[PDB]
mmCIF file of C-alpha atoms and ligand atoms in Angstrom:
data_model
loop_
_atom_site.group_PDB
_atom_site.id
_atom_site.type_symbol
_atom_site.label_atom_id
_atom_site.label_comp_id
_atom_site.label_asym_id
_atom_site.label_seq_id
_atom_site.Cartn_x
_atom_site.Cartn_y
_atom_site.Cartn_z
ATOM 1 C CA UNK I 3 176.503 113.018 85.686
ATOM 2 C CA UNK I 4 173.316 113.253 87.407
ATOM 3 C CA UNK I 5 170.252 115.288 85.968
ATOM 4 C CA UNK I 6 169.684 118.953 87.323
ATOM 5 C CA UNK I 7 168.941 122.256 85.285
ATOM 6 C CA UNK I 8 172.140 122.884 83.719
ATOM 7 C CA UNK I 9 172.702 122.818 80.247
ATOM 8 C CA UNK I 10 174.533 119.608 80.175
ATOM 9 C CA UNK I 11 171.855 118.094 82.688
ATOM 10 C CA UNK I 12 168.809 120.334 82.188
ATOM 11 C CA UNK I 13 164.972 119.108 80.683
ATOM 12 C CA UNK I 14 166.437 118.370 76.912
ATOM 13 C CA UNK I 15 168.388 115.879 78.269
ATOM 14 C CA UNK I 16 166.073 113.618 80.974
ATOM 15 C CA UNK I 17 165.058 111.537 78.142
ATOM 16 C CA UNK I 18 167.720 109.454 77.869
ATOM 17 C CA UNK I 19 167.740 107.773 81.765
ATOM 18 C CA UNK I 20 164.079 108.833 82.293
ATOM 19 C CA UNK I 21 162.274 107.682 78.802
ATOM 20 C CA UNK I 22 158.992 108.449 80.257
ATOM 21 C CA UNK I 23 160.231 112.074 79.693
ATOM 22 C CA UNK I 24 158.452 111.490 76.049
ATOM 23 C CA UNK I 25 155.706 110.174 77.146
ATOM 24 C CA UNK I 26 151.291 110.195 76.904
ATOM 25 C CA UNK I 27 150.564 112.600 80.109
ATOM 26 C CA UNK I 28 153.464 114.801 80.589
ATOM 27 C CA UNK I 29 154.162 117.724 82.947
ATOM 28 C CA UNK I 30 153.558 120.812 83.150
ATOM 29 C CA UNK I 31 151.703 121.988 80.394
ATOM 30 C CA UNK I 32 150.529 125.155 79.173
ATOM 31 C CA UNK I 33 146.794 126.193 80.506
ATOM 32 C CA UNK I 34 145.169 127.381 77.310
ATOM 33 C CA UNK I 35 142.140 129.392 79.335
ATOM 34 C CA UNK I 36 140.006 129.463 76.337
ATOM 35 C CA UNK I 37 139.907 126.096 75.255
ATOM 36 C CA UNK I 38 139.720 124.694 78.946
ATOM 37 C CA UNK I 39 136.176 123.841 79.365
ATOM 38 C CA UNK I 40 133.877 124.516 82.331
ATOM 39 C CA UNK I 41 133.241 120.964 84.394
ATOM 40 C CA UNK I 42 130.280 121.965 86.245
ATOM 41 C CA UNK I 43 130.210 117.945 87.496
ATOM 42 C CA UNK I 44 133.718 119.328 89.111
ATOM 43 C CA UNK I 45 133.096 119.560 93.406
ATOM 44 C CA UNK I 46 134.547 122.050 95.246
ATOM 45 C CA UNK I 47 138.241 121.423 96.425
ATOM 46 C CA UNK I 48 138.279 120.090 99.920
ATOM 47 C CA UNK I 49 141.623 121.565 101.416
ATOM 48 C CA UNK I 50 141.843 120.635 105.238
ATOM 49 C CA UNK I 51 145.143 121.795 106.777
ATOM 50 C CA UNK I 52 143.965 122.478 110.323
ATOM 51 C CA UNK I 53 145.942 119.637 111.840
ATOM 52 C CA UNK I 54 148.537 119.438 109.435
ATOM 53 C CA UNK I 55 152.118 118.487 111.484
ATOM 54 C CA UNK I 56 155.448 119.977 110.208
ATOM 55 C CA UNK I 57 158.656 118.247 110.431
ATOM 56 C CA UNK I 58 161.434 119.680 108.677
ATOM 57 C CA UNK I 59 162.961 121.295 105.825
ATOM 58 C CA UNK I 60 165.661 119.816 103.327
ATOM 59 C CA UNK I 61 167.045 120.993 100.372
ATOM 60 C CA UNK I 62 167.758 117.832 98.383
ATOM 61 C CA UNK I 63 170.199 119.651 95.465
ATOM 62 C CA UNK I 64 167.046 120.445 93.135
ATOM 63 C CA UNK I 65 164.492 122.526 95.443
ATOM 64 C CA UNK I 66 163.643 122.573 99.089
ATOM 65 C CA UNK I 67 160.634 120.401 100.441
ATOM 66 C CA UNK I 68 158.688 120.789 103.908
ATOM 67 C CA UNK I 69 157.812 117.834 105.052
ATOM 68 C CA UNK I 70 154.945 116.597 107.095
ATOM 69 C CA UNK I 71 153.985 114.225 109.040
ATOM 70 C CA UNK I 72 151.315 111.708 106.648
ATOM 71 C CA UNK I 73 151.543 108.822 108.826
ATOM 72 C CA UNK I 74 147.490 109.506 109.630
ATOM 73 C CA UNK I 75 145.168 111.429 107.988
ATOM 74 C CA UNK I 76 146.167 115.164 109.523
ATOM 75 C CA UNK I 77 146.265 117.002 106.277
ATOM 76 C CA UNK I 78 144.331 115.837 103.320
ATOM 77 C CA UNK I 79 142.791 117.011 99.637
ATOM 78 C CA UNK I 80 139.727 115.722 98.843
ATOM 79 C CA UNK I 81 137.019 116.709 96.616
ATOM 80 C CA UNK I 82 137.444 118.587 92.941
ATOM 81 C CA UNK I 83 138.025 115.997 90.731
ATOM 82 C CA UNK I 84 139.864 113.609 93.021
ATOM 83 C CA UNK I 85 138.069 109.755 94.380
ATOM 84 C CA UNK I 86 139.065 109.272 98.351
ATOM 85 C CA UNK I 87 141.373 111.158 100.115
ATOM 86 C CA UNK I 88 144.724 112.546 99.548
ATOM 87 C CA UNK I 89 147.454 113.127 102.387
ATOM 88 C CA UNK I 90 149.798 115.923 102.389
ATOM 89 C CA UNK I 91 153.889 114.757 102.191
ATOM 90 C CA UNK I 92 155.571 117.899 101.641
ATOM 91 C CA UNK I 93 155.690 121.261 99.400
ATOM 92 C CA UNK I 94 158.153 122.629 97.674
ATOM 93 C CA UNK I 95 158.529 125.485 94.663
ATOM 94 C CA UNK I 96 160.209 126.074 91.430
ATOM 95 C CA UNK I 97 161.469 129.358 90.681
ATOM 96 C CA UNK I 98 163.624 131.697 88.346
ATOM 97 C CA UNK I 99 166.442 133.995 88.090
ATOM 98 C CA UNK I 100 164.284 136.838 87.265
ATOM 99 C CA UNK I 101 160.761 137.569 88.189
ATOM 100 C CA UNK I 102 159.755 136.747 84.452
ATOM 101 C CA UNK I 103 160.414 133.134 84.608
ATOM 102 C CA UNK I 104 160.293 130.458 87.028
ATOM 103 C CA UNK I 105 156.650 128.728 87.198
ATOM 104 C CA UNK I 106 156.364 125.537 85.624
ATOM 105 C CA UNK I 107 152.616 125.299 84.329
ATOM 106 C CA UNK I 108 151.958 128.876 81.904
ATOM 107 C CA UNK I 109 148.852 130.339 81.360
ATOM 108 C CA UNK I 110 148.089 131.417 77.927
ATOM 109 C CA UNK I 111 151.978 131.210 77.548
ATOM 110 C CA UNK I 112 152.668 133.377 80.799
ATOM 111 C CA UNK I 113 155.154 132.593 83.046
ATOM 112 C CA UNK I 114 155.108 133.426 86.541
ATOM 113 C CA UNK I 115 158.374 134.181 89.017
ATOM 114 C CA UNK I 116 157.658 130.836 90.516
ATOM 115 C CA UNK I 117 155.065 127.650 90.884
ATOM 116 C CA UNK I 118 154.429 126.564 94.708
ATOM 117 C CA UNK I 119 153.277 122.209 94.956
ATOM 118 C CA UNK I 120 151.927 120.523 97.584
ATOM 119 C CA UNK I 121 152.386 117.258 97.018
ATOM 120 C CA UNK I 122 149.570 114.788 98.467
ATOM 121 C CA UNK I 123 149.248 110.808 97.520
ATOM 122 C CA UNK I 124 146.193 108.699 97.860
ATOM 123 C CA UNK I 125 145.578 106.799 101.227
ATOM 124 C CA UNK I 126 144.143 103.714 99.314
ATOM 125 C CA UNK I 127 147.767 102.957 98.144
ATOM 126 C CA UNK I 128 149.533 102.643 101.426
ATOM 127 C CA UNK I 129 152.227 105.026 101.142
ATOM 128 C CA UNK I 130 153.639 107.313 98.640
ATOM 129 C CA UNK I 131 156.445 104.994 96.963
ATOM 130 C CA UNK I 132 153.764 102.628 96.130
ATOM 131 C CA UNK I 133 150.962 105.817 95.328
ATOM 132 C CA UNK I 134 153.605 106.651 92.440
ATOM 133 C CA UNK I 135 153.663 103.839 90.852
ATOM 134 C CA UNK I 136 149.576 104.576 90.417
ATOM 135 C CA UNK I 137 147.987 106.460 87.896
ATOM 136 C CA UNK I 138 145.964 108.293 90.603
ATOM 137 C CA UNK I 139 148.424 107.879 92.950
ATOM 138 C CA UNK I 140 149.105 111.512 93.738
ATOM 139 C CA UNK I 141 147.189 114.973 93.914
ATOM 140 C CA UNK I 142 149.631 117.889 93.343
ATOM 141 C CA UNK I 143 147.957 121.396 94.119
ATOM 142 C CA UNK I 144 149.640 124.087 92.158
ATOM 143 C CA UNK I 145 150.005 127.491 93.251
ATOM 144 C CA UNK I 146 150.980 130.711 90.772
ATOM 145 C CA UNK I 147 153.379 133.337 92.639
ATOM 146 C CA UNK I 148 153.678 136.920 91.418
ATOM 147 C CA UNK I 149 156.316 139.602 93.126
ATOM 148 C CA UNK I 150 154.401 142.718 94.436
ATOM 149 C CA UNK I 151 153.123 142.456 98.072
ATOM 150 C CA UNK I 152 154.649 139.608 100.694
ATOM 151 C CA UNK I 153 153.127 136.965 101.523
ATOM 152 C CA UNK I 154 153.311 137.269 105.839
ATOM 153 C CA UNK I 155 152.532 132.924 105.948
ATOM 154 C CA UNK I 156 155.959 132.788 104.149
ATOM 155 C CA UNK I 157 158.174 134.344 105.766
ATOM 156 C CA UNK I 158 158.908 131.600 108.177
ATOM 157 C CA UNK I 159 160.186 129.390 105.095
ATOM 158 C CA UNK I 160 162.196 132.089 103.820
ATOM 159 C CA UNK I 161 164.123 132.920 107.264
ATOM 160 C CA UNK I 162 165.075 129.410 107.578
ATOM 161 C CA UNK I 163 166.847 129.052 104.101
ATOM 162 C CA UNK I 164 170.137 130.486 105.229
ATOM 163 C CA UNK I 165 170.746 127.122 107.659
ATOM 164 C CA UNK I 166 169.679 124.413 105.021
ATOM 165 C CA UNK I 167 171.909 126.569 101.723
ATOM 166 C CA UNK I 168 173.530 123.699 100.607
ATOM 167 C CA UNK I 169 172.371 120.321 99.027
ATOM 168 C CA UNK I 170 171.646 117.741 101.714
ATOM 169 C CA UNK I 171 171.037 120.128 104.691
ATOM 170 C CA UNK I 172 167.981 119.876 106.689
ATOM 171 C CA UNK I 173 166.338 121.827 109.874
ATOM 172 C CA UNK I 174 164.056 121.090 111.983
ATOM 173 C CA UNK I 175 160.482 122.735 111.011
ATOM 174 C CA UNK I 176 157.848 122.556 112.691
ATOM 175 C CA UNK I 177 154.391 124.244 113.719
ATOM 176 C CA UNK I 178 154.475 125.810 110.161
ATOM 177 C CA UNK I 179 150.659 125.840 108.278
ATOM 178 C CA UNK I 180 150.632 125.732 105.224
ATOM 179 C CA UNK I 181 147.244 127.653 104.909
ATOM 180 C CA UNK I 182 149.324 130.877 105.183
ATOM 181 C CA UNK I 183 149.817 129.946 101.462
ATOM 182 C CA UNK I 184 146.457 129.561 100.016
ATOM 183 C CA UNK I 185 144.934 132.665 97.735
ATOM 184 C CA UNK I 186 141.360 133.375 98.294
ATOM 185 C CA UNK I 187 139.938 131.260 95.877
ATOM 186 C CA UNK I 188 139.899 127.653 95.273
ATOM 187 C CA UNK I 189 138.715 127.605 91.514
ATOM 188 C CA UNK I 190 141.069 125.617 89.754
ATOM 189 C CA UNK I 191 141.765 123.853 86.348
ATOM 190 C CA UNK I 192 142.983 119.881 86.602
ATOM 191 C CA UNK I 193 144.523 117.664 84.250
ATOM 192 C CA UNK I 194 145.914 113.965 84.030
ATOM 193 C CA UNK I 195 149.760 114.737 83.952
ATOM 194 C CA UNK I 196 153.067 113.622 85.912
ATOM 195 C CA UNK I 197 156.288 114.329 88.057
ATOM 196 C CA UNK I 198 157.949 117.664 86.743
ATOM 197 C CA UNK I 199 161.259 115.957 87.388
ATOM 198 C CA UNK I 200 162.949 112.763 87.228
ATOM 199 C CA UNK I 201 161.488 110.092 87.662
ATOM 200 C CA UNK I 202 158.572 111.600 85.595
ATOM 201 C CA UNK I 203 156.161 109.310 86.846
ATOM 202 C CA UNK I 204 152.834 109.881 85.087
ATOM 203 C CA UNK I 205 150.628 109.546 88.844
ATOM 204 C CA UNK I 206 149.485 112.897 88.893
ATOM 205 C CA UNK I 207 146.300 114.504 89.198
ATOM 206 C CA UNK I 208 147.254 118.430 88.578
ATOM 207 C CA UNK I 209 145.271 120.920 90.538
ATOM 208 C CA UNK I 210 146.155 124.312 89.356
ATOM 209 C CA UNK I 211 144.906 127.379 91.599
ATOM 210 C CA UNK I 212 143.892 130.328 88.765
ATOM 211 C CA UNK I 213 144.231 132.950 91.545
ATOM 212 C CA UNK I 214 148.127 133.433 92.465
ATOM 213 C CA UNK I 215 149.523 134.234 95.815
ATOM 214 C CA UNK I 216 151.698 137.637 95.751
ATOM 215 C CA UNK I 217 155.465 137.622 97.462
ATOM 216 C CA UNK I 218 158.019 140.306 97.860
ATOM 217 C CA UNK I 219 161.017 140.798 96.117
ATOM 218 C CA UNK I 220 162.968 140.480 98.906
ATOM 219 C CA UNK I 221 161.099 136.798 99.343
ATOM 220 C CA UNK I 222 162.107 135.467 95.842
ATOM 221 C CA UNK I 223 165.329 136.892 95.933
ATOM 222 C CA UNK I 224 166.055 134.838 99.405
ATOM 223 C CA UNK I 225 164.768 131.680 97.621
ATOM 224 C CA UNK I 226 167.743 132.158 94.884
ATOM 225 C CA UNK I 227 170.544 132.397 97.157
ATOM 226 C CA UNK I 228 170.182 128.790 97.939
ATOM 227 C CA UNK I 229 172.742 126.736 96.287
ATOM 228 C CA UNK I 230 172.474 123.480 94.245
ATOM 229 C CA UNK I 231 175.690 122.418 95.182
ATOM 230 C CA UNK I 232 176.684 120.448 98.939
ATOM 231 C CA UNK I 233 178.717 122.563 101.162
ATOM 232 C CA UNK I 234 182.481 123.044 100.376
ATOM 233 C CA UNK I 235 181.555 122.149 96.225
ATOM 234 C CA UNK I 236 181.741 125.418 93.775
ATOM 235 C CA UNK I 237 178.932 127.163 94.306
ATOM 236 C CA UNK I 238 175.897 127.175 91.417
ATOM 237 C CA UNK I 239 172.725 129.391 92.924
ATOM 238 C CA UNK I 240 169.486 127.281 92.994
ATOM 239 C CA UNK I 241 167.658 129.190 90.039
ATOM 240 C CA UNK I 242 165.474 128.269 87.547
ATOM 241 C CA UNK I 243 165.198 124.876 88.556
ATOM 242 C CA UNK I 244 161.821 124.485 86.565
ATOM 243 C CA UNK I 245 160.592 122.072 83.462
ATOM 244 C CA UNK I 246 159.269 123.806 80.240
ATOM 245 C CA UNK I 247 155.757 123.248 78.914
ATOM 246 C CA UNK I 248 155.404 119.584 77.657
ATOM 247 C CA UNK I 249 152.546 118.668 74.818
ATOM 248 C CA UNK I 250 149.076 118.348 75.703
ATOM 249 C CA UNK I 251 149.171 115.408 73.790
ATOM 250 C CA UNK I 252 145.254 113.673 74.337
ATOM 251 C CA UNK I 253 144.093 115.930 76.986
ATOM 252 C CA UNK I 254 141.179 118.177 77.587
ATOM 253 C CA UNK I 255 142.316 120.589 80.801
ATOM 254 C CA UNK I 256 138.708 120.985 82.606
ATOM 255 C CA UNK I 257 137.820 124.138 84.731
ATOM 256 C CA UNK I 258 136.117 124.104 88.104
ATOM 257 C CA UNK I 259 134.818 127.461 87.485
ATOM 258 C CA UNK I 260 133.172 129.998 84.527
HETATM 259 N N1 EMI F 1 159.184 100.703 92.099
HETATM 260 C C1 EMI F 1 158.792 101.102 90.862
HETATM 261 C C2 EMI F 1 158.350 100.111 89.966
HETATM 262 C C3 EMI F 1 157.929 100.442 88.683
HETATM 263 C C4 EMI F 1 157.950 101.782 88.287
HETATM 264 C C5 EMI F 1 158.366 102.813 89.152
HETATM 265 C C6 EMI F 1 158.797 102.561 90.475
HETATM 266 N N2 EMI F 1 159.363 103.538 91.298
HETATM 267 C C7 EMI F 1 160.098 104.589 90.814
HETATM 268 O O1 EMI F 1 160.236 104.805 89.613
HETATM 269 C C8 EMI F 1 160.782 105.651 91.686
HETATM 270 C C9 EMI F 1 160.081 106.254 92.739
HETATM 271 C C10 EMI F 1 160.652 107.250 93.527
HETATM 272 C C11 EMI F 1 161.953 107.694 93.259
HETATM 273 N N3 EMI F 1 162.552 108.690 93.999
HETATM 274 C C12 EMI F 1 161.987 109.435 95.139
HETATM 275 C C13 EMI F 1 160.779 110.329 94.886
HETATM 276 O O2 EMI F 1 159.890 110.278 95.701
HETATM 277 N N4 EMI F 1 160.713 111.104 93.800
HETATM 278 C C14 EMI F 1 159.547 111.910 93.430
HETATM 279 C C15 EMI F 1 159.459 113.193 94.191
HETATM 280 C C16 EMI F 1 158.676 114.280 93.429
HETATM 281 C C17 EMI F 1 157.521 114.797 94.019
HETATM 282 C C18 EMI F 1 156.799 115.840 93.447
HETATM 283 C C19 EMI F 1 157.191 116.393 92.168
HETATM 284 S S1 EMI F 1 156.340 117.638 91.401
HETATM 285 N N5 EMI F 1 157.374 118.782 90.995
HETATM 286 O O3 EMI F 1 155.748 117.020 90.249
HETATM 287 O O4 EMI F 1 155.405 118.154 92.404
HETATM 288 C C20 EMI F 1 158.361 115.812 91.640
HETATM 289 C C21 EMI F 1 159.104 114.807 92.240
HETATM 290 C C22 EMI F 1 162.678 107.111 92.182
HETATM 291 C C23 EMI F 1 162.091 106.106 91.400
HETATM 292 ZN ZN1 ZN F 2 157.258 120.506 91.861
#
């Protein structure tokens, strides 16, 4: 009886083996735009993906993750509101079963059809089993996506999802860059927060991209015909596998831009 997104497993219930679930910094959280206030002390992001090394792709029963390679400094975050330098481990996104629902952070109570992370953890800790146990341990950038156009720096990911459909399946995946995902613009808004799931670990330093990246239809619908389930188990489609809004509790969300 492990937790997942069900109703007998889902967000209401994570509390219990994952007490943290109640805790000081939660995420994600709702991005009130008016009452986040301008930081002009905030840098510039410092996104630098040119030598970033894919590996592989697995779905692990809750979302699917590309992995890279972050045993040297290939594809790091630095800058914003972030001290030293943050390598990329692997991205992954939360989405719905209808293009109304699916991100994890709102904005102004919107939801959008799904909420794209790459997940980076601070070099001064080592690695990133000992970066989580940090409260600056990790730098997730957060990426809004809307359906109308495709995204063409996708469409790699989504053609592979048909060999890794079941939980515990991986592929091989590499040469894939993961600036084919980036909108335009890098302003952002940041907060202190955590994990989204279990174990909730509150290590994060949220990076949340205002601008989002468009996808097709056909894109988001290839992204819910994964399964949650491992092969030959009854099938349950990998949808909405996103956390509500948690309480701002004693935060002030600061904006990089006006
Ligand atoms: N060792 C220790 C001592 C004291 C307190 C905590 C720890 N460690 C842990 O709690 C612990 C660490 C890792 C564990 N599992 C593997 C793991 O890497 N999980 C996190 C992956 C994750 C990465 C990104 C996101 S998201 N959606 O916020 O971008 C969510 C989840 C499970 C438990
Ligand atoms: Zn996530």
């Amino acid at each position: 009886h492990h937790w997942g997104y069900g109703k007998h497993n889902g967000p209401e219930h994570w509390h219990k083996d994952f007490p943290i679930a109640k805790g000081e910094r939660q995420s994600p959280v709702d991005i009130d735009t008016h009452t986040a206030k301008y930081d002009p002390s905030l840098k510039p992001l410092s996104v630098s993906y040119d030598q970033a090394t894919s590996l592989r792709i697995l779905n692990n029963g809750h979302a699917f993750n590309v992995e890279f390679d972050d045993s040297q400094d290939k594809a790091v975050l630095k800058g914003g509101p972030l001290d030293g330098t943050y390598r990329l481990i692997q991205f992954h996104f939360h989405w719905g079963s209808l293009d109304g629902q699916g991100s994890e952070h709102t904005v102004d109570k919107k939801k959008y059809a799904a909420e794209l992370h790459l997940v980076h953890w601070n070099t001064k800790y080592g690695d990133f089993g000992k970066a989580v146990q940090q409260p600056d341990g990790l730098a997730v950038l957060g990426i809004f996506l809307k359906v109308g156009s495709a995204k063409p720096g996708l469409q790699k990911v989504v053609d592979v999802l048909d060999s890794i459909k079941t939980k515990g399946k991986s592929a091989d995946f590499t040469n894939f860059d993961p600036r084919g995902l980036l909108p335009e613009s890098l302003d952002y808004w940041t907060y202190p927060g955590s994990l989204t799931t279990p174990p909730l670990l509150e290590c994060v330093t949220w990076i949340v991209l205002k601008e989002p990246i468009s996808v097709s239809s056909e894109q988001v619908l290839k992204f819910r015909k994964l399964n949650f389930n491992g092969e030959g188990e009854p099938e349950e489609l990998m949808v909405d596998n996103w956390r509500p809004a948690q309480p701002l509790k004693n935060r002030q969300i600061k904006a990089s831009f006006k």
